[PDB]
């Protein structure tokens, strides 16, 4: 069923080479080679986690016969009110060790051992502000002691949390900011979704002035709304049998925002 | 009945010459001539007991004229909370000697006498963490007093036990890790299982993209699950008079897990 195949495809996800992802990877290679700790910040739909998964899925783990894996980059995501044990538990599991019951110092000692054993160069912590205030002592320690670039990813609240501890603030001072699309850059990006992501049977001409007004007012420049609006409009218009997106059907999806 | 022959076959067990098995035997052969004690670690479904048993089926006992049997590799699995007597009883019984009503310091001396007499080069202790903490003094005494390589085999808990005692950690510091299957290695192994183990009259072709998605999700890289799943799908399928495993019957099995 050709319709149902497109509804099963379009509700999926992709990664697109965009300037704001290519920029991050050139920057994170700089921090990894230089071993310098830093932070990535910006508004919640700019696509920072996709840009970091595109980094983790490049730089693949290397396998040597019967050795533990050599893992250049670690990406973890903490749970809410993450304590020192929960950070160490996750780093240990990500490098493929099972964590056995122990005191906080057993988890600390085993984590330091597996980070130094797996040859880790960079540790990326998503949603860094889920960390409890004391755990940053253990993150500073990992970065002081081992040759590891810690990268904190968050939004503008993360800075409101980092600024409550002088020891973290003066270490995680170097930063890159993820920004919103505009002008020619929003215009050019809409064409990339039409031709690389949506795969509709005839051109929808989404970059035209009568259509960019609709899409501009809907998306505000957020890449996370652009992908959401254009998948929802494609799913909906195919279930009505059109080979395109058009003015009225896109205004139906945008009127939900 | 032709059908009754095949279900009796698939229910049993067989050993597949995986790279990981070859990697262990080549490593333990370095350790056997060098006479160095070591440990093997890895997750519980990764192939460890079978890889150690295959090394015991190599190097089977010699029997030249007018001598005791020479037994280069001993392999044992302790029971749970194994005491100093019970370890000596297993080493003695593996070497085919009967043992009679000793106190523990008789069992110790009779064990040292048969370990010398049989010319044992290596002692593989499977599930090493079943050992009570005090029995390691007898394992170190075997390893130091005799020219024996002891190989402790176990899970990530074994490390937690060993790290509680400096005396042991140091005799057994070196290590090899068993790990899970991934990428092209998972795909090559599924192809090998189909032709090597399953042997159905018509091809099921499970290296096909659509079928590897079911198996990768169902098995998560453990050689254990992969085998059980492929066997259960051949058994069930054969009982219903089919010539192959197919997409629907394989999903019927994998859902139980």
């Amino acid at each position: 069923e050709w319709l149902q195949a497109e509804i099963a495809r379009l509700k999926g996800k992709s990664i697109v080479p965009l300037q704001q992802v290519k920029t991050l990877h050139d920057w994170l290679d700089g921090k990894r080679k230089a071993r310098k700790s830093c932070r990535v910040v910006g508004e919640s739909r700019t696509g920072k986690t996709v840009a970091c998964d595109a980094y983790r899925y490049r730089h693949k783990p290397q396998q040597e016969a019967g050795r533990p894996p050599t893992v250049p980059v670690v990406y973890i995501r903490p749970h809410q009110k993450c304590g020192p044990k929960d950070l160490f538990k996750k780093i240990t599991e990500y490098l493929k060790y099972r964590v056995t019951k122990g005191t906080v110092s057993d988890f600390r000692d085993r984590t330091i051992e597996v980070l130094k054993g797996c040859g880790v160069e960079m540790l990326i912590i998503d949603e860094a502000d889920r960390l409890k205030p004391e755990t940053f002592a253990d993150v500073r320690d990992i970065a002081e002691d081992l040759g590891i670039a810690v990268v904190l990813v968050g939004t503008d609240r993360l800075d409101a949390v980092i600024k409550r501890d002088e020891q973290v603030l003066e270490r995680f001072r170097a930063h890159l900011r993820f920004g919103k699309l505009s002008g020619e850059d929003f215009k050019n990006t809409v064409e990339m979704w039409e031709q690389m992501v949506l795969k509709l049977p005839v051109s929808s001409n989404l970059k035209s002035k009568e259509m960019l007004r609709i899409l501009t007012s809907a998306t505000e420049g957020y890449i996370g709304r652009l992908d959401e609006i254009l998948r929802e409009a494609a799913i909906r218009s195919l279930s009505r049998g059109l080979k395109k997106i058009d003015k009225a059907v896109l205004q139906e999806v945008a009127k939900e925002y | 009945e032709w059908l009754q022959a095949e279900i009796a076959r698939l229910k049993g067990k067989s050993i597949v010459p995986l790279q990981q098995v070859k990697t262990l035997h080549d490593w333990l052969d370095g350790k056997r001539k060098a006479r160095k004690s070591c440990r093997v670690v890895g997750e519980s479904r990764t192939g460890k007991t079978v890889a150690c048993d295959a090394y015991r089926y190599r190097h089977k006992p010699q029997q030249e004229a007018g001598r005791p049997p020479t037994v280069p590799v001993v392999y044992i699995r302790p029971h749970q909370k194994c005491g100093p007597k019970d370890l000596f009883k297993k080493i003695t019984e593996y070497l085919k000697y009967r043992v009679t009503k000793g106190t523990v310091s008789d069992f110790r001396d009779r064990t040292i006498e048969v370990l010398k007499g049989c010319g044992v080069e290596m002692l593989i202790i499977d599930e090493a963490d079943r050992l009570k903490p005090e029995t390691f003094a007898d394992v170190r005494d075997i390893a130091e007093d005799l020219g024996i390589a002891v190989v402790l085999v176990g899970t990530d808990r074994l490390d937690a036990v060993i790290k509680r005692d400096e005396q042991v950690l140091e005799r057994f510091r070196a290590h090899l890790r068993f790990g899970k299957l991934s990428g092209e290695d998972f795909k090559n192994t599924v192809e090998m299982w189909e032709q090597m183990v399953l042997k159905l009259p018509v091809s099921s072709n499970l290296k096909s993209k659509e079928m590897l998605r079911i198996l990768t999700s169902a098995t998560e890289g453990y050689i254990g699950r992969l085998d059980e799943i492929l066997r259960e799908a051949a058994i069930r399928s054969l009982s219903r008079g089919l010539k192959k495993i197919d997409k629907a019957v394989l999903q019927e099995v994998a859902k139980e897990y």
Partner: peptide, 14 residues
């Protein structure tokens, strides 16, 4: 220019 399926990236990973 190349675009990636987020599930193909998962399948290709270590």
């Amino acid at each position: 220019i190349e675009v990636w399926d987020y599930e193909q990236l998962r399948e290709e990973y270590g």
